[PDB]
Amino acid sequence: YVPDAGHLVWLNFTPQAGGGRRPALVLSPAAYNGVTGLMQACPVTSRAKGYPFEVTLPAHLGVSGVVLADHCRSLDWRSRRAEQLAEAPADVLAEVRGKLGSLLGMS
Amino acid sequence: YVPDAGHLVWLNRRPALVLSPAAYNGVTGLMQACPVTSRAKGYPFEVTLPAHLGVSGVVLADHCRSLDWRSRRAEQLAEAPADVLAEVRGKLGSLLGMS
């Protein structure tokens, strides 16, 4: 498995001092993800507050929570044991990218 | 101090290039930024910093991330030239699927 853009994946995180697993939406394409072992992904949070960078997930996908578009981050998907859960529809991906691109100053 | 877009900053310590603007960074305490490294290898997402800028190395455009800059005590180093900022945004935008 190599994550691809639009995949919703489980991703581990582990504390330094003595963690869990959280869903994330992948934005970068498999071509990149497979030659670096990294991906750009946005976390899914259970806390929907109406924050403007939240992107809602349709109920039919089965994934509870909202995507935090402005929390995109480079993460090592091999070390974090990425596991595909679902695939987001094109309009969800477009909303995440539009909001994040606005924040990053993309023209 | 509140980091602004194009600023090169010290962060807990290493340099970074800030992409998000002060109007977001100040209200949230977060920013989107790319790390700077002296280990230029010529790999595809590196962006070279010009000499005598105040900080040396390459920007790793593909390692952009959201982070809390207050807890890392961000401190301004310089301002990136517009062409460096535009090249980082071009490479990262392509990586993020933004065309």
Binding site: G19, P43, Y51, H71, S79, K99 | -
Partner: peptide, 30 residues
Amino acid sequence: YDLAALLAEMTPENLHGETDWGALEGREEW
């Protein structure tokens, strides 16, 4: 998406803190 329109909708109550991804893993630079 206009950034100013987005930022105008932020409030102290709807802010999210930094997402915790734990320790640095693998090929992560930071």
